[PDB]
Structure 1
Amino acid sequence: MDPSSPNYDKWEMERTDITMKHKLGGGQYGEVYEGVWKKYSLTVAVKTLKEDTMEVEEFLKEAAVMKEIKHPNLVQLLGVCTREPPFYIITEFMTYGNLLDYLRECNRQEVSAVVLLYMATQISSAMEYLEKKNFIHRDLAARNCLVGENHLVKVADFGLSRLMTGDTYTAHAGAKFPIKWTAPESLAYNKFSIKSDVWAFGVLLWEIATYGMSPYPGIDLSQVYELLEKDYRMERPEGCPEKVYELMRACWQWNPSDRPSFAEIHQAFETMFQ
């Protein structure tokens, strides 16, 4: 917009510059469309807001939040169109889609053990950065990660709460939570911190080591807490290095203060990967 204007925002861009297309992922992400940033012949993802919905306040808050973060392993904000409806939030488009489906559909000969370790290392790096900035993710899981070229992985947040139609998210006082990725303190006291993100990261590592399997297979949601309290934890996935599993259990300590920090988790992975 206008550089001299009192309301100048470098991120605001021209709605006309983007060629809007079909909805991304057959609708799995919601009101997110594939687009073409003409000026650069660049394919992008454009999240928008339904036909004037009572969520503008939340939408704009997301946009503001994204303008505050930047890291090679966090989906990159490219611009916004929150001056006049329909509101837009544009980020890069990741060629191979979300990590969950990527892991389930990949060439396992290509996506070997070293590659899995590499993917977990990139994710821990992004979280280490959010930790540093005192930000909290709240919904860390393979489904919220994107895969680019050369196994580049980036953490995102698609606000899947009401989008998912499966048993991943379950109701709780007008809100939905992915019970199998939620820390005990979060299920019991609605307390979310970077430590509950670390617990969720533990589950994510499990998803990665199993090439995308569902957590606590077979166990019904209503008994998960009790079991975690009884000190039950997921077994070491087949082929999962001892060191990585050791990391998993540390993330699953009942007491959050006893869980390693992402700084420690990442430092550990670097050592390993090398």
Structure 2
Amino acid sequence: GEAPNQALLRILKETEFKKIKVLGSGGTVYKGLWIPEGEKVKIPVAIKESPKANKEILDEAYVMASVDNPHVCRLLGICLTSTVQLITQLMPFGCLLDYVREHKDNIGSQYLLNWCVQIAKGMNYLEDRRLVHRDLAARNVLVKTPQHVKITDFGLAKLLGAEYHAKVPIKWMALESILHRIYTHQSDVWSYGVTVWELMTFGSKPYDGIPASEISSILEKGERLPQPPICTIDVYMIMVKCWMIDADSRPKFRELIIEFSKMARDPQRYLVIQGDEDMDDVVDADEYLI
């Protein structure tokens, strides 16, 4: 027996939004203000604006409405206009992949290790809610402040019952997923390892210049992503443990929290980086609880 999902799905009027600029297209992601009726608050939001693709975006809203954790992006509501719109909290600093790329020369060890802690906390929460993400990557981690990141993009996420089978991001998937289309929380751990490598290399592309069709044979021969320059063996060994063939001998998200937490207490024993060492009624969504 599975527990009843008593999450609320907030349907928001279209007149409650004063959508401002466009953030980025691909669909489209807007930014704007959400002003609930006569609540005297202005909440900065992001809005994601024809066919059966409506089914997918609503499957996304189902997952996002059913999560509540400081390191997971939650759905504020949907607007049922001509198009189905997803309304989420504005993450004003962008995605973490763009952030580490545009700020390499100003990111210290404490920030890198804290992000690894927070991402592991969010993933451990998803595991607690029996959620396999299947698209964990630096591009899908958003930055509320440089000290606070959250996981987003649940378009591939699936709810395990009391391994899931099935276009996918090859250079982030465990071998068993590339080969057998098998996805578990431990295959998420593999993607976590690639995501940490992304941060540790300040946004390098994993297997840059290697066709995705070759990834399965490369991983089978025993090859893995190289040790990033700033990484001590301690940190790189954690990433290598995420890439083991035996999925059960990979670290659990609850262990990665612990390990990175200890390292974040002495961040330079583990990362070697040169240089280390309107408004008025605006309320962040994390402070608007209903």
Give the partner amino acid of 1:11. R
- Partner of residue 221, structure 1: 212
CA distance in 2, matches of 1:157, 1:252: 23
Partner of residue 132 from structure 2, selected from 114, 130, 136? 136
Q: CA deviation at 1:258?
A: 1.7
Partner of residue 260 from structure 1, selected from 251, 256, 275? 251
Q: CA deviation at 1:77?
A: 2.0
Give the partner amino acid of 2:109. A
CA distance in 2, matches of 1:218, 1:112: 28
With structure 1 as the length reference, what TM-score do the two structures score? 0.83
Deviating runs (4+, > 4 A) in structure 1?
Answer: none
Asked whether the equivalents of residues 184 and 254 of structure 1 are also in contact (C-alpha less than 8 Å), the reply is yes
Q: Does 1:68 align with 2:66?
A: yes
Give the partner amino acid of 1:76. R
CA distance in 2, matches of 1:12, 1:98: 26
Asked whether the equivalents of residues 111 and 146 of structure 2 are also in contact (C-alpha less than 8 Å), the reply is no
Please list the CA deviations of residues 3-29 of structure 1 after superposition, one character each: whole Å capped at 9, or x if unmatched.
Answer: xxxxx956222221011234322x14x
Partner of residue 171 from structure 2, selected from 180, 194, 210? 180
Q: CA deviation at 1:117?
A: 0.7
Q: CA deviation at 1:56?
A: 1.9
Corresponding residue SS for 1:81: strand
CA distance in 2, matches of 1:196, 1:67: 24
- Partner of residue 33, structure 1: 30
Give the partner amino acid of 1:210. T
Partner of residue 57 from structure 1, selected from 52, 55, 58? 55
* Unmatched runs of 5 consecutive residues or more in structure 2: 1-6, 157-165, 266-290
Corresponding residue SS for 1:63: helix
| Aligned CA-pair RMSD | 2.1
Higher RCO (CA-CA < 8 Å; seq separation 6+)? 2
* Unmatched runs of 5 consecutive residues or more in structure 1: 1-7, 161-174
Asked whether the equivalents of residues 32 and 47 of structure 1 are also in contact (C-alpha less than 8 Å), the reply is yes
CA distance in 1, matches of 2:255, 2:14: 42
Corresponding residue SS for 1:153: strand
With structure 2 as the length reference, what TM-score do the two structures score? 0.79
Give the partner amino acid of 1:138. R
Q: Does 1:198 align with 2:195?
A: no
- Partner of residue 18, structure 2: 19
Asked whether the equivalents of residues 34 and 46 of structure 1 are also in contact (C-alpha less than 8 Å), the reply is yes
Q: CA deviation at 1:217?
A: 2.8
Q: CA deviation at 1:107?
A: 5.1
Q: Does 1:42 align with 2:33?
A: no
Asked whether the equivalents of residues 144 and 158 of structure 1 are also in contact (C-alpha less than 8 Å), the reply is no
Q: CA deviation at 1:265?
A: 1.3
Q: CA deviation at 1:69?
A: 0.4
